[PDB]
Amino acid sequence: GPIRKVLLLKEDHEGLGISITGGKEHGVPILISEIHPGQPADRCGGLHVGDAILAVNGVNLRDTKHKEAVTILSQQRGEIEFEVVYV
Amino acid sequence: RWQDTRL
Numbered sequence: 001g002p003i004r005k006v007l008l009l010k011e012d013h014e015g016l017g018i019s020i021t022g023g024k025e026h027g028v029p030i031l032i033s034e035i036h037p038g039q040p041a042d043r044c045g046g047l048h049v050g051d052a053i054l055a056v057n058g059v060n061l062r063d064t065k066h067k068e069a070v071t072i073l074s075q076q077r078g079e080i081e082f083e084v085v086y087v
Numbered sequence: 088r089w090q091d092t093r094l
Contacts, residue, residue: 021091033091066090073094 003054006046006082016073016080017041020053023066029053030061030069031087051084 010016017039022031029052041047053061053069057076061069 016094019091019093021089023090026089028089034093036093066092070092070094 001085001087003083003085004046006044006084008040008044008047008080008082010040010076010078010080012077014040016076017043018047020066020069020073022052023069024063025065029087030064030066032084047082047084048086050086052087053082053084055083057081 017036018032018041019034020030021033022028032047032049032051035041055061056073057080059072
């Protein structure tokens with residue numbers, strides 16, 4: 001499927017506004033499980049429940065364990081670019 | 088069986 005590059009803008013006091021599931025220990029990609037209403041992912045658009053997050057800000061998430069992806073994602077700030085594919 | 092984390 002198409003790999004989309006999706007922009008999200010975040011203030012430091014905000015979260016991304018997504019929940020993630022999956023990861024290497026489960027044999028699946030990092031997958032978006034929820035978009036939270038009114039938070040940056042919802043406001044900015046472009047992300048979809050069931051999307052695999054292949055990368056964020058150029059950092060590859062394809063073979064990351066869940067907690068590793070949580071760390072990387074949680075450390076991104078400001079103008080953030082996701083690369084996602086719906087699965 | 089999967090973890091789920093809000094970010």
